[PDB]
């Protein structure tokens, strides 16, 4: 999706990605509307 | 009677109910302890009933610092080409 | 720089006797970064204001000093001196609007880039274009908790009364039993003594069985009773959230309120769904925050609405106040700077870093985890 | 009053019906090496 | 009822067979294995309280009842304890709406004049329309302080204002009679014109707007006991009774 | 099974957003962000939630 953003293929990602330095520096992101981030999900007194 | 022959027997019997081996004037106003006994045992058994009713949080645990030196192996996991890798 | 007085971010407090930030060191034992600010102390007004230069320091000031070893700043750190945020307000010839305290300050020119709990919102960013947000923390609700919580019959005292009519009738009836086949209180003692297990002791036999049998029944039914009451045990739910009907009827006796024309103030006029308890808010707002804060541990108000960055950050310090509700309205913050200033991509560039390093966890660690 | 108290009360009256029929021949055994 | 079949054991049957059942088997093999009522009927009795004061092989194999015996009190506790967790006209056909003068406090309703309600009930009860109009308010607000302070038995009104009142009630002291007992269930509706082009669709918008769930939408976000002094009673009742029993030989 | 649980829900890593990827210098940066702005402050986000 960032690639085709950048060689004016599409002008809008509306796709679920996350904000990183690379990819902030090719392309400009609007503010977030929904919080993420790095987390981890594990299985089952 | 005895100072302590009879007197923490006595004591020590009224707090259950199953007293058998439990035997002038004076003990009787003293046996009413048994009422303080049981409502001290019903107030905690309500109080039980009332109150009976993972990692660390990170990637700072030693679990993940240390993978094959603790005894369980761990897979961990991540999605490629996205983030996380990166990340 | 302008910042706004936050307890969890800007701890303003006066310098030392020769006018320099007190040296401090942190229970890690690291030094802590302290930058002077020149902001007025006297928060009333009509007092005579004095631009003393207090010592400012907390989570926004690591961030800043970041921003300027990454960057070249030459920050001052000029508090704000009306001690408000501000979004929108007129005074005299009501026919335009203009913005008060940081904000206004950051429009007219005067300050520069801000590192405070300002939050993202739409009016804001009409004018001032903000940065990546280092922080959501969605805004809650603050409540006071709850107190910690029958040694008699809760309720209809007359079992004292039949019981010891019982007792008298069972003995008398024993006394009957007895001179038709133990004088004064010996089958009372008796009836004390089943009640109470200690162990002291055929109409007769059958007639002290069946009075025997229903003396366990009182008690039974009492430690039944006791058990039972874990049902209400009083501690209702506070608030719940926003969208709870407790909070849809606005009542007097329940008072709660923000602090300003902060983000919440702008949320509340922006949805217009509950005008008529939207307004119940507007006659009794505090100056600050920190005056809310006192006045709900003062019992005063019994419901504070602030960031939930702020309010749990209280709450963890001072063990008195609960925070009612998860999430609503998540706006982050953000460094308000100008629509001019050159250094937006590099502010956004060193927020990005500053996350995807563990800055920002070092720095919650040292000013937002506590016991 | 329902599955349960019946059930439990059929196990029980079980229980006691084979343990008065088994302590008869048991204390009589006994008796019996006791006083052989 | 207090301490009867509604608070516990609704059939009031089983138990009291069951319980005279297992007393017999109990007394049967005691004497199988002193006195058949000397003694057993005294070890039946009190094997249900642990301080049996004048208790004195044969008993080993008879102790295994008390384990019953606790069970049996702990379920009784168990169920006690369970089963107390937590609108008498129902509706014009009962009495106090056709004969008030039966009761010796008189009936005082209530109905808003110049309705739909007093119009509703000339046509179904017309000698009870006098009665009506004997006690009426000028709006709502008279009817339910009336209520509040109690100068109004009961109140009769439509069926959507009532519930809404009773919804938001200081103090939920105002209530309906239940659901489903409607004396006349009707509908609002809104009105129009004999012969406006309108109708047909209006109440197509109307049906749209209850089929796509707007209508539900719309809705929301706009609107020591009785037994304690029987058992007593019952328990004097039956020491009377066996006293009187025992002395009549 | 509702067998799988996180770690809690503020002990995020690097607590990032998502939000909408535009082209580099492209014009509808400023409405995209009144927009986003304006459904974050009204009641279509929290609905969407
Ligand atoms: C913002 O950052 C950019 C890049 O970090 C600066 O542009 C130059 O970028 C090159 C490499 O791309 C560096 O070698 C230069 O040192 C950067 N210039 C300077 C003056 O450092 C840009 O100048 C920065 N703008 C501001 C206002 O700090
Ligand atoms: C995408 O993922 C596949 C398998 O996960 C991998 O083989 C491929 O190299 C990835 N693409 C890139 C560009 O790395
Ligand atoms: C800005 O700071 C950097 C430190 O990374 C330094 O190398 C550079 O010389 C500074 N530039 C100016 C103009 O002060
Ligand atoms: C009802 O209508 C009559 C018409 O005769 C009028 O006299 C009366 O005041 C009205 N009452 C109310 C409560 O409107």
Same mark, same amino acid.
Not at chain 3, 242 to 267: G, W
Not at chain 3, 294 to 303: E, G, I
Not at chain 5, 92 to 115: A, C, I, M, W
């Given at each position: 999706?960032? $690639?085709?953003?950048?060689?004016?293929?599409?002008?809008?990602?509306? $796709?679920?990605?996350?904000?990183?330095?690379?990819?902030?520096?090719?392309?400009?992101?609007?503010?977030?509307?929904?919080?993420? $981030?790095?987390?981890?999900?594990?299985?089952?007194? | 009677?005895?100072?302590?022959?009879?007197?923490?027997?006595?004591?020590?019997?009224?707090?259950?109910?199953?007293?058998?081996?439990?035997?002038?004037?004076?003990?009787?106003?003293?046996?009413?302890?048994?009422?303080?006994?049981?409502?001290?045992?019903?107030?905690?058994?309500?109080?039980?009933?009332?109150?009976?009713?993972?990692?660390?949080?990170?990637?700072?645990?030693?679990?993940?610092?240390?993978?094959?030196?603790?005894?369980?192996?761990?897979?961990?996991?991540?999605?490629?080409?996205?983030?996380?890798?990166?990340? | 720089?302008?910042?706004?007085?936050?307890?969890?971010?800007?701890?303003?407090?006066?310098?030392?006797?020769?006018?320099?930030?007190?040296?401090?060191?942190?229970?890690?034992?690291?030094?802590?970064?302290?930058?002077?600010?020149?902001?007025?102390?006297?928060?009333?007004?009509?007092?005579?204001?004095?631009?003393?230069?207090?010592?400012?320091?907390?989570?926004?000031?690591?961030?800043? #000093?970041?921003?300027?070893?990454?960057?070249?700043?030459?920050?001052?750190?000029?508090?704000?001196?009306?001690?408000?945020?501000?979004?929108?307000?007129?005074?005299?010839?009501?026919?335009?609007?203009?913005?008060?305290?940081?904000?206004?300050?950051?429009?007219?020119?005067?300050?520069?880039? #801000?590192? +405070?709990?300002?939050?993202?919102?739409?009016?804001?960013?009409?004018?001032?274009?903000?940065?990546?947000?280092?922080?959501?923390?969605?805004?809650?609700?603050?409540?006071?908790?709850?107190?910690?919580?029958?040694?008699?019959?809760?309720?209809?005292?007359?079992?004292?009364?039949?019981?010891?009519?019982?007792?008298?009738?069972?003995?008398?009836?024993?006394?009957?039993?007895?001179?038709?086949?133990?004088?004064?209180?010996? +089958?009372?003692?008796?009836?004390?003594?089943?009640?109470?297990?200690?162990?002291?002791?055929?109409?007769?036999?059958?007639?002290?069985?069946?009075?025997?049998?229903?003396?366990?029944?009182?008690?039974?039914?009492?430690?039944?009773?006791? +058990?039972?009451?874990?049902?209400?045990?009083?501690?209702?739910?506070?608030?719940?959230?926003?969208?709870?009907?407790?909070?849809?009827?606005?009542?007097?006796?329940?008072?709660?309120?923000?602090?300003?024309?902060?983000?919440?103030?702008?949320?509340?006029?922006?949805?217009?769904?509950?005008?008529?308890?939207?307004?119940?808010?507007?006659?009794?707002?505090?100056?600050?925050?920190?005056? +809310?804060?006192?006045?709900?541990?003062?019992?005063?108000?019994?419901?504070?609405?602030?960031?939930?960055?702020?309010?749990?950050?209280?709450?963890?310090?001072?063990?008195?106040?609960?925070?009612?509700?998860?999430?609503?309205?998540?706006?982050?913050?953000?460094?308000?700077?100008?629509?001019?200033?050159?250094?937006?991509?590099?502010?956004?560039?060193?927020?990005?870093?500053?996350?995807?390093?563990?800055?920002?966890?070092?720095?919650?660690?040292?000013?937002?985890?506590?016991? | 009053?329902?599955?349960?108290?019946?059930?439990? !009360?059929?196990?029980?009256?079980?229980? /006691?019906?084979?343990? /008065? !029929?088994?302590?008869? /021949?048991? /204390?009589?055994?006994?008796?019996?090496?006791?006083?052989? | 009822?207090?301490?009867?079949?509604?608070?516990?054991?609704?059939?009031?049957?089983?138990?009291?067979?069951?319980?005279?059942?297992? *007393?017999?088997?109990?007394?049967?093999?005691?004497?199988?294995?002193?006195?058949?009522?000397?003694?057993?009927?005294?070890?039946?009795?009190?094997?249900?309280?642990?301080?049996?004061?004048?208790?004195?092989?044969?008993?080993?194999?008879? *102790?295994?009842?008390?384990?019953?015996?606790?069970?049996?009190?702990?379920?009784?506790?168990? &169920?006690?304890?369970?089963?107390?967790?937590?609108?008498?006209?129902?509706?014009?056909?009962?009495?106090?709406?056709?004969?008030?003068?039966?009761?010796?406090?008189?009936?005082?309703?209530?109905?808003?004049?110049?309705?739909?309600?007093?119009?509703?009930?000339? &046509?179904?009860?017309?000698?009870?329309?006098?009665?009506?109009?004997?006690?009426?308010?000028?709006?709502?607000?008279?009817?339910?302080?009336?209520?509040?302070?109690?100068?109004?038995?009961?109140?009769?009104?439509?069926?959507?204002?009532?519930?809404?009142?009773?919804?938001?009630?200081?103090?939920?002291?105002?209530?309906?009679?239940? *659901?489903?007992?409607?004396?006349?269930?009707?509908?609002?509706?809104?009105?129009?014109?004999?012969?406006?082009?309108?109708?047909?669709?209006?109440?197509?918008?109307?049906?749209?707007?209850?089929?796509?769930?707007?209508?539900?939408?719309?809705?929301?976000?706009?609107?020591?006991?009785?037994?304690?002094?029987?058992?007593?009673?019952?328990?004097?009742?039956?020491?009377?009774?066996?006293?009187?029993?025992?002395?009549?030989?």
């Amino acid at each position: 999706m960032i $690639g085709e953003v950048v060689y004016q293929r599409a002008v809008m990602a509306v $796709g679920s990605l996350t904000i990183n330095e690379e990819r902030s520096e090719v392309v400009d992101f609007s503010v977030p509307f929904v919080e993420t $981030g790095i987390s981890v999900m594990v299985s089952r007194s | 009677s005895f100072t302590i022959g009879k007197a923490i027997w006595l004591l020590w019997g009224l707090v259950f109910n199953n007293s058998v081996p439990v035997q002038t004037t004076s003990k009787i106003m003293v046996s009413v302890w048994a009422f303080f006994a049981v409502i001290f045992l019903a107030s905690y058994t309500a109080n039980l009933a009332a109150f009976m009713i993972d990692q660390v949080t990170g990637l700072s645990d030693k679990k993940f610092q240390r993978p094959h030196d603790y005894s369980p192996p761990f897979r961990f996991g991540t999605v490629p080409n996205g983030s996380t890798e990166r990340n | 720089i302008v910042t706004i007085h936050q307890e969890p971010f800007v701890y303003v407090k006066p310098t030392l006797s020769d006018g320099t930030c007190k040296e401090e060191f942190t229970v890690n034992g690291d030094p802590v970064k302290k930058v002077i600010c020149t902001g007025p102390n006297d928060t009333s007004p009509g007092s005579p204001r004095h631009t003393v230069p207090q010592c400012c320091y907390g989570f926004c000031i690591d961030l800043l #000093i970041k921003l300027a070893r990454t960057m070249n700043f030459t920050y001052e750190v000029h508090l704000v001196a009306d001690g408000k945020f501000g979004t929108q307000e007129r005074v005299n010839n009501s026919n335009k609007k203009e913005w008060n305290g940081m904000m206004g300050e950051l429009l007219s020119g005067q300050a520069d880039m #801000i590192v +405070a709990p300002l939050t993202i919102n739409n009016e804001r960013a009409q004018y001032i274009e903000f940065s990546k947000p280092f922080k959501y923390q969605g805004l809650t609700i603050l409540v006071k908790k709850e107190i910690p919580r029958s040694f008699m019959q809760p309720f209809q005292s007359t079992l004292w009364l039949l019981v010891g009519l019982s007792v008298h009738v069972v003995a008398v009836m024993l006394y009957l039993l007895d001179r038709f086949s133990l004088t004064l209180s010996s +089958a009372m003692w008796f009836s004390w003594g089943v009640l109470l297990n200690s162990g002291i002791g055929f109409s007769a036999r059958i007639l002290g069985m069946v009075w025997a049998g229903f003396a366990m029944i009182i008690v039974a039914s009492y430690t039944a009773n006791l +058990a039972a009451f874990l049902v209400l045990d009083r501690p209702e739910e506070r608030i719940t959230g926003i969208n709870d009907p407790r909070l849809r009827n606005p009542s007097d006796k329940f008072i709660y309120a923000t602090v300003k024309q902060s983000s919440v103030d702008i949320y509340f006029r922006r949805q217009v769904e509950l005008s008529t308890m939207y307004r119940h808010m507007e006659k009794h707002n505090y100056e600050s925050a920190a005056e +809310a804060i006192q006045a709900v541990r003062d019992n005063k108000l019994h419901a504070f609405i602030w960031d939930s960055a702020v309010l749990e950050f209280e709450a963890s310090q001072k063990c008195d106040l609960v925070t009612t509700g998860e999430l609503f309205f998540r706006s982050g913050f953000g460094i308000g700077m100008r629509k001019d200033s050159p250094w937006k991509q590099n502010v956004s560039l060193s927020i990005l870093k500053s996350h995807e390093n563990g800055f920002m966890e070092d720095l919650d660690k040292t000013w937002v985890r506590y016991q | 009053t329902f599955e349960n108290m019946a059930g439990v !009360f059929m196990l029980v009256a079980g229980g /006691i019906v084979a343990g /008065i !029929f088994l302590i008869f /021949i048991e /204390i009589a055994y006994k008796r019996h090496k006791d006083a052989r | 009822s207090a301490f009867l079949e509604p608070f516990s054991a609704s059939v009031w049957v089983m138990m009291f067979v069951m319980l005279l059942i297992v *007393s017999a088997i109990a007394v049967f093999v005691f004497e199988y294995f002193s006195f058949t009522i000397g003694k057993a009927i005294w070890l039946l009795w009190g094997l249900v309280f642990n301080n049996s004061v004048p208790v004195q092989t044969s008993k080993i194999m008879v *102790s295994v009842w008390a384990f019953f015996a606790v069970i049996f009190l702990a379920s009784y506790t168990a &169920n006690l304890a369970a089963f107390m967790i937590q609108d008498q006209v129902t509706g014009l056909s009962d009495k106090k709406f056709q004969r008030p003068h039966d009761y010796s406090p008189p009936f005082r309703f209530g109905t808003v004049p110049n309705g739909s309600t007093e119009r509703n009930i000339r &046509n179904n009860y017309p000698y009870m329309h006098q009665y009506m109009t004997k006690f009426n308010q000028k709006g709502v607000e008279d009817a339910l302080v009336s209520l509040k302070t109690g100068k109004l038995d009961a109140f009769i009104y439509d069926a959507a204002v009532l519930n809404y009142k009773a919804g938001r009630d200081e103090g939920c002291k105002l209530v309906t009679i239940g *659901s489903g007992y409607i004396f006349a269930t009707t509908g609002y509706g809104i009105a129009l014109q004999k012969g406006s082009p309108w109708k047909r669709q209006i109440d197509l918008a109307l049906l749209q707007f209850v089929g796509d769930g707007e209508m539900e939408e719309l809705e929301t976000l706009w609107l020591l006991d009785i037994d304690n002094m029987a058992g007593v009673f019952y328990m004097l009742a039956a020491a009377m009774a066996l006293s009187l029993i025992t002395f009549i030989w």
